Ligand binder design. Sequence first.
Ligand SMILES: Nc1ncnc2c1ncn2[C@@H]1O[C@H](COP(=O)(O)OP(=O)(O)O)[C@@H](O)[C@H]1O
Ligand SMILES: Nc1snnc1-c1ccc(C(F)(F)F)cc1
Ligand SMILES: [Cl-]
Ligand SMILES: [Cl-]
Ligand SMILES: [Mg+2]
Ligand SMILES: [Mg+2]
Length: 265
Amino acid sequence: QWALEDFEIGRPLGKGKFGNVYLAREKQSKFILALKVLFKAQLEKAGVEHQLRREVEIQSHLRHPNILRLYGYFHDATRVYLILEYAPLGTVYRELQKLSKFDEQRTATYITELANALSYCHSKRVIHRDIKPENLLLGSAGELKIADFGWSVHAPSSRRTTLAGTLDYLPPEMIEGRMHDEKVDLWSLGVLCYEFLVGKPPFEANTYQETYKRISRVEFTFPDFVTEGARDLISRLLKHNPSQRPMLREVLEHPWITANSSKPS
Ligand SMILES: Nc1ncnc2c1ncn2[C@@H]1O[C@H](COP(=O)(O)OP(=O)(O)O)[C@@H](O)[C@H]1O
Ligand SMILES: Nc1snnc1-c1ccc(C(F)(F)F)cc1
Ligand SMILES: [Cl-]
Ligand SMILES: [Cl-]
Ligand SMILES: [Mg+2]
Ligand SMILES: [Mg+2]
């Protein structure tokens, strides 16, 4: 169906390990979108063809206001193209670097939107497993949208692919290569809440080996300015035993969230 000739390419929107994303406009409809370009050669080399198919299949059937749309795909002799919804206000990552840290109302609103989107995902037993600021985009009204479903699977699961970059957002069971389920996303939710309020993730360290150690032992402390309500929520989410982590309904109905968020469930 679609081919490259159907689109006019614009400015670079961002880069990932494999993804090279551009602003684009479809010629006949003038529809503005984001084009995610991947190189077949590096995809074959890393042997992650299965990750790309899972990304296309899972994301294209999901329909939720806080989840980025995937309209379609096409491919030539060298590249693969994903046709995505364009997010005009950029990443949460960039926004965090601008402001250094978010206030309690901004943080609570983001968490509510995340919890809403994850609740929808888990209802189909879809787990994301790669929730971090670079993969959270912002709509035209500043609303949060989850993207990059390249690591997503159906629960329960093991891990068959090599862990690439940072360990900062992964729970002990995933890092120790053990079996895991939906509760991995809730650990990540706890890591984000901390980083949103503090300015850096709770287990950050100088080396891979040390970050590994702090995560498996759950070693984190709060700065003085973090209030009692925030500490309660974060402490509940960062449990070593996954079955002790709260349900998403509990997060959405937490007194600190309900008092500070500006959006409903
Ligand atoms: N729909 C989009 N709108 C705006 N920017 C995007 C969009 N998709 C991706 N980007 C930018 O490109 C970067 C990489 O996209 P992503 O799909 O996460 O690539 P990868 O899967 O290689 O990590 C993101 O961090 C973001 O900054
Ligand atoms: N042809 C090659 S080579 N390496 N990956 C591919 C590939 C990966 C994903 C798809 C997709 F259909 F899911 F979109 C198609 C092709
Ligand atoms: Cl290109
Ligand atoms: Cl306190
Ligand atoms: Mg990404
Ligand atoms: Mg990816």
